[PDB]
Amino acid sequence: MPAYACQRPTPLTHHNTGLSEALEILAEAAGFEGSEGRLLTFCRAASVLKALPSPVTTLSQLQGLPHFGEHSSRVVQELLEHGVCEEVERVRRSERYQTMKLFTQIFGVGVKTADRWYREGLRTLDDLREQPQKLTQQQKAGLQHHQDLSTPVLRSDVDALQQVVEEAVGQALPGATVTLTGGFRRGKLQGHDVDFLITHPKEGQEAGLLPRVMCRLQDQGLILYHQFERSFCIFRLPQPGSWKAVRVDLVVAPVSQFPFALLGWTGSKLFQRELRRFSRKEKGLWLNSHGLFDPEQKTFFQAASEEDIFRHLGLEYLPPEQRNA
DNA sequence: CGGCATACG
DNA sequence: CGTA
DNA sequence: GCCG
Numbered sequence: 449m450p451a452y453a454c455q456r457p458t459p460l461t462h463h464n465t466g467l468s469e470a471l472e473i474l475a476e477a478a479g480f481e482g483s484e485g486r487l488l489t490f491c492r493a494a495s496v497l498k499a500l501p502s503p504v505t506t507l508s509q510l511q512g513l514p515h516f517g518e519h520s521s522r523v524v525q526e527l528l529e530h531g532v533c534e535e536v537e538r539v540r541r542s543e544r545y546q547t548m549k550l551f552t553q554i555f556g557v558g559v560k561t562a563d564r565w566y567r568e569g570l571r572t573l574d575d576l577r578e579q580p581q582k583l584t585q586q587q588k589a590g591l592q593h594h595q596d597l598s599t600p601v602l603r604s605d606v607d608a609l610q611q612v613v614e615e616a617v618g619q620a621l622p623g624a625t626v627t628l629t630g631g632f633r634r635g636k637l638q639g640h641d642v643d644f645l646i647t648h649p650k651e652g653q654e655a656g657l658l659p660r661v662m663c664r665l666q667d668q669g670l671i672l673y674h675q676f677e678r679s680f681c682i683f684r685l686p687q688p689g690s691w692k693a694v695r696v697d698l699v700v701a702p703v704s705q706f707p708f709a710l711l712g713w714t715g716s717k718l719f720q721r722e723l724r725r726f727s728r729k730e731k732g733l734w735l736n737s738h739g740l741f742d743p744e745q746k747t748f749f750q751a752a753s754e755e756d757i758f759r760h761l762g763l764e765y766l767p768p769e770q771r772n773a
Numbered sequence: 774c775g776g777c778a779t780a781c782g
Numbered sequence: 783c784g785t786a
Numbered sequence: 787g788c789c790g
């Protein structure tokens with residue numbers, strides 16, 4: 449088992465679901481306390497289990513696995529012997545964990561804002577609604593739409609949405625294309641938001657495109673909230689006899705950068721962090737969603753495909769469905 | 774021990 | 783600060 | 787919290 453998640457296939461469904469979910473609770477709780485290092489270790493340990501070919505049934509099976517030290521091993525040991533880990537359950541039922549989770553899941557609220565509100569004594573969404581003076585426009589939209597945004601978007605919703613985006617994109621710039629990215633590209637059947645990547649086959653034609661796309665979607669009455677090359681929006685999605693609010697991310701990239709943007713925006717988040725860490729620490733190359741830079745030659749790699757990028761980095765290619773780290 | 778992804782709005 |  |  450290699451140490452970086454980008455070095456091994458990770459399928460969406462696997463053989464250690466309960467163990468990985470418990471470790472991910474501890475990772476999330478570490479994030480709420482500002483401990484990014486502990487968050488990473490717990491996420492990496494959970495991801496190792498997702499990549500295993502069969503269930504862990506005995507503690508011995510963790511020997512040699514990366515990211516399993518005393519703490520993550522004890523969590524697994526308690527789950528194997530008792531079906532529950534006391535530390536995990538204590539986190540789950542803690543006021544701090546529950547409130548930080550509730551607040552950070554609001555669009556416009558991160559860990560830092562959630563933590564400040566927590567320290568001020570705030571605990572519920574109604575607490576926030578009573579003091580709207582405290583809220584940015586973005587947070588007001590996130591709070592008003594919170595219920596709909598807490599409902600998963602179904603893969604079965606996505607195609608009709610892609611068609612409306614494609615119509616606005618085609619008016620904004622004929623020949624421009626729309627690619628579904630994010631978790632849905634990795635095979636997920638649900639998500640918290642839909643992610644689209646827009647480009648045009650003629651380099652440079654995409655300049656200034658996103659404002660034109662947004663204006664057209666707004667004029668069609670589809671945008672409940674927005675506000676360049678990235679837009680984090682709230683869209684109106686049709687439902688039987690009504691509609692629901694959905695989060696949609698739109699990104700524009702020049703075609704020269706499209707494979708890098710496709711790779712970055714397809715995730716998973718941990719996969720991309722691990723891939724960029726591998727690139728820098730093992731290969732000496734700097735990776736982002738625009739390119740891959742050799743800081744010794746001061747040159748950018750050209751890529752025409754995601755396959756090119758994996759080859760550049762000396763890694764076996766993984767299709768999106770195996771990037772569910 | 775240092776390091777932990779890397780960007781845009 | 784927020785967002786991916 | 788863990789790796790190197």
Ligand SMILES: Nc1nc2c(ncn2[C@H]2C[C@H](O)[C@@H](COP(=O)(O)OP(=O)(O)OP(=O)(O)O)O2)c(=O)[nH]1
Binds near residue numbers: 555598629643717
């Ligand atoms: N506000 C909010 N954020 C969420 C929720 N579920 C997951 N997240 C966070 C976890 C990650 O930091 C981030 C992942 O979103 P992305 O669109 O970048 O990733 P991906 O498409 O894999 O995830 P998704 O399936 O849409 O949840 O969103 C949720 O219900 N609400």
Ligand SMILES: [Ca+2]
Binds near residue numbers: 630641643786
């Ligand atoms: Ca997203």
Ligand SMILES: [Ca+2]
Binds near residue numbers: 630631640643
């Ligand atoms: Ca998504």
Ligand code: NA
Binds near residue numbers: 553
């Ligand atoms: Na949030």
